[PDB]
Design a protein around this ligand. Structure first.
Ligand code: UPG
Ligand code: NAG
Ligand code: CA
Length: 276
């Protein structure tokens, strides 16, 4: 397909949002789309419904089942294992014939033609991530990356959010990025205090040697970090956790994104159509 997106979802709530993410992508593009799923975390009901979504929204899809290598340090916490699947196996999850894939979070709402990210220049980087917003000034106390360890490590480089990222698989394979990320993760994870945010900390840690193309800030907006004024420019939205309010996930979705209920109700209408 012209646009290839992968995502990971574990739980009924994240599968419900994953269907919404997919409908939002297809409402904003006429280019061909293929969705790739990390199979082992999904429910039987989701896997049964995905051909119905595919036929209604007009996309292709594929399930990838990749076993965690025995040598590689395992993660006992399911959340951390799922983070490992986002970042450690980018060279082995997809076929050698696929040249590019984008990770889009299951809780995202897309408001752009995702082919614009496929066409974005990476200047030789094997992947691109958006930076964490600095625009919501009242949240500065929670930007852990602006002081301590990260401020000294980064030397003014951005601390990137891992909700969305484009992977040029040809370049990623040319650089042996997959083998190098697995080895650094294995060494660093011997310390259980390292890589607190595994999927996010690992590429940010490796960005002096596995380059990151810093994407336009508009590629990823999250209310927690980003101003209300920049929402209108946002290409995609992440429903990231707000450590100050601790607002529930579905409340954030309905309150922030006016079209969320429309996609949710449309997918539920498709489900009642297939059921009868
Ligand atoms: O498929 C999923 C994803 C998350 N959770 C749980 O939901 C809670 C909160 O996680 P989540 O909704 O993923 O937090 P976000 O704030 O959305 O996550 C942000 O920060 C994470 C790194 O900390 C990145 O992986 C995400 O892409 C980014 O959106 C945790 O208990 C997770 O285990 C699930 O049950 N299933
Ligand atoms: C898809 O094609 C139709 C053709 O009339 C056009 O109106 C619509 O804007 C196109 N959408 C995108 C995202 O290109
Ligand atoms: Ca998220």
């Amino acid at each position: 397909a012209e646009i290839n997106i992968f995502s990971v979802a574990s739980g009924h709530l994240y599968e419900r949002m994953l269907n919404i993410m997919m409908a939002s992508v297809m409402h904003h593009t006429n280019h061909t789309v293929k969705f790739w799923f990390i199979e082992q975390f999904l429910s039987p009901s989701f896997k049964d419904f995905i051909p119905h979504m595919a036929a209604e929204y007009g996309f292709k899809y594929e399930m990838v089942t990749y076993k965690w290598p025995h040598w590689l340090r395992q993660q006992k916490e399911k959340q951390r294992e799922i983070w490992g699947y986002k970042i450690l196996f980018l060279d082995v999850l997809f076929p050698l014939s696929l040249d590019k894939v984008i990770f889009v979070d299951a809780d995202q709402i897309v408001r752009t033609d995702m082919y614009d990210l496929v066409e974005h220049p990476l200047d030789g980087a094997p992947y691109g991530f958006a930076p964490m917003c600095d625009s919501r000034v009242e949240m500065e106390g929670y930007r852990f990356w602006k002081t301590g360890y990260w401020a000294n490590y980064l030397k003014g480089k951005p601390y990137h959010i891992s909700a969305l990222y484009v992977v040029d698989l040809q370049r990623f394979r040319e650089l042996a990025a997959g083998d190098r990320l697995r080895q650094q993760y294995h060494a660093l994870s011997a310390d259980p205090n390292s890589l607190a945010n595994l999927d996010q900390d690992l590429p940010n840690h490796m960005q002096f040697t596995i380059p990151i193309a810093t994407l336009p800030q508009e590629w990823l907006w999250c209310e927690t970090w980003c101003s209300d004024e920049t929402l209108k420019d946002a290409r995609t939205i992440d429903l990231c956790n707000n450590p100050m309010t601790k607002e529930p996930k579905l409340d954030r979705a309905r309150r922030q994104v006016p079209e969320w209920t429309k996609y949710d109700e449309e997918i539920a209408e498709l489900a009642r159509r297939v059921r009868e």
